[PDB]
């Protein structure tokens, strides 16, 4: 259920949940949800789709 | 770091995701930062900022 996308720039993972990629690398993306990293009041962080959440 | 409000429940599907409830207030870790979950050729998956990737 995927499409091959291409990295535009090197990205250096800042946290274990992130992915190191190099410029021009072929990657597989899903269906292509867009995610925000957030933290709740019990101080747990994680990703949620950004269309579930409002400023 | 700004406060955001959950518009709907979200049930985490992976350990990196976060369960939220409708109307829950959360802290958004970096505004102007949307993430895509991608997988590389060695089958490692992780989140990358979406503007580093070209579709």
Author numbering:
A (entry chain C): 4 to 33, 35 to 59
B (entry chain A): 5 to 59
Q: Can you list sentences taken from the study reporting this PDB entry?
A:
Nck proteins are composed of three N-terminal SH3 domains and a single C-terminal SH2 domain (reviewed in Ref. 3). Nck recruitment is required for complete T cell activation, and its inhibition dampens TCR signaling by reducing Zap70 phosphorylation. The objective of the present study was to initiate development of an inhibitor of the Nck/TCR interaction, specifically by blocking binding of the first SH3 domain in Nck (Nck1-SH3.1) to the PRS in the CD3ϵ subunit of the TCR. During our studies, it became clear that Nck-SH3.1 exhibits conformational diversity and can swap half the number of its residues to form a dimer.
During the crystallization efforts that led to the monomeric apo- and peptide-bound Nck1-SH3.1 crystal structures, seven more structures were determined that all exhibited domain swaps, leading to dimers. The swaps are located at the exact same position in all structures (i.e. Lys-36 in the n-Src loop), clearly visible based on the high-resolution electron density. Dimers are formed by exchange of the C-terminal 25 residues, almost half of the entire SH3 domain. The interface thus generated contains a short anti-parallel β-sheet encompassing the CD3ϵ sequence 36KSWW39. Superposition of the Nck1-SH3.1 structure with the bound CD3ϵ peptide shows that domain swap and tight peptide binding are mutually exclusive. The C-terminal half of the SH3.1-binding sequence would get into steric conflict with the second SH3.1 domain in the dimer. All of the dimers are swapped in the same manner, but with different juxtapositions of the second SH3.1 domain with respect to the first. To assess the structural variability of the dimers, 38 individual chains with well-defined electron density throughout were superimposed onto the first half of the molecule. The hinge at Lys-36 provides quite a bit of flexibility that allows the dimer to pack in many different crystal lattices. Indeed, the hinge region varies over ∼6 Å within the superposed ensemble, and the distal loop covers a distance of ∼8 Å in the dimers.
